[PDB]
Amino acid sequence: DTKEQRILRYVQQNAKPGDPQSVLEAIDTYCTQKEWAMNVGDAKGQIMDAVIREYSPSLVLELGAYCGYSAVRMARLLQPGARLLTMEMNPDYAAITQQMLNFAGLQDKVTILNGASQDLIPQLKKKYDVDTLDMVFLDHWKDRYLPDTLLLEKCGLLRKGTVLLADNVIVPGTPDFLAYVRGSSSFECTHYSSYLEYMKVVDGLEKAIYQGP
Ligand SMILES: Nc1ncnc2c1ncn2[C@@H]1O[C@H](CSCC[C@H](N)C(=O)O)[C@@H](O)[C@H]1O
Numbered sequence: 001d002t003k004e005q006r007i008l009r010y011v012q013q014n015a016k017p018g019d020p021q022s023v024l025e026a027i028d029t030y031c032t033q034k035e036w037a038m039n040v041g042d043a044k045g046q047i048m049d050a051v052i053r054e055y056s057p058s059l060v061l062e063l064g065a066y067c068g069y070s071a072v073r074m075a076r077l078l079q080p081g082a083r084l085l086t087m088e089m090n091p092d093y094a095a096i097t098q099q100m101l102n103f104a105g106l107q108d109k110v111t112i113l114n115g116a117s118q119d120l121i122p123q124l125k126k127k128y129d130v131d132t133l134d135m136v137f138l139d140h141w142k143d144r145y146l147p148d149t150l151l152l153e154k155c156g157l158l159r160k161g162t163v164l165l166a167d168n169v170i171v172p173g174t175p176d177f178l179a180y181v182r183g184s185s186s187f188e189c190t191h192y193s194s195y196l197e198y199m200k201v202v203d204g205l206e207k208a209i210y211q212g213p
Pocket residue numbers: 038039040041063064065066067068069070071087088089090093115116117118139140141144
């Protein structure tokens with residue numbers, strides 16, 4: 001098996017079906033005690049939770065799903081009827097994520113789109129009936145953060161107040177994105193210093209709120 005299949009099986013055997021908090025705890029335990037994996041983790045996850053609670057977004061887009069940890073973490077905090085769309089290019093990972101969401105009981109709140117963000121973003125309005133997004137979690141390959149932000153804006157998917165929350169702005173880092181949003185009058189930015197998942201290494205999140213053109 002793969003590490004991702006091992007994570008899934010661990011959840012299935014050490015968490016309670018339909019209990020998202022138990023799922024998060026099982027993943028965190030496995031990734032602390034057995035094998036590291038690139039989930040946002042509990043340190044940064046607590047900051048994400050605080051942000052989600054503040055904004056109560058009705059429609060969230062996540063870029064990069066992996067095994068579903070962040071999707072579970074966000075979706076468990078959504079209000080009834082609110083929704084998450086998550087984009088995942090790797091079909092093996094998409095299948096893990098779906099199974100993870102199913103086990104957590106969150107499958108009605110989340111749609112996992114199997115494809116590359118740069119191909120799926122232009123389809124959101126017509127194919128997926130999206131008007132504008134309330135929040136975007138950027139956590140895919142770091143070189144896509146700026147191009148996809150710019151694409152989201154081109155596609156008319158951002159509105160005044162759309163919250164972008166970007167993982168890993170220190171490690172691995174996303175220097176072009178960070179410079180761009182911090183220098184642009186179209187974003188109001190805040191840095192949340194934290195730690196790399198499961199590691200004593202500094203990392204951080206950036207929140208960038210879109211202000212319009
Ligand atoms: N352009 C792209 N579109 C969609 N998925 C992408 C992508 N570039 C990378 N990915 C995916 O981005 C993921 C990054 S890891 C995502 C971790 C997850 N957000 C969590 O915290 O639990 C990987 O699964 C990778 O396959």
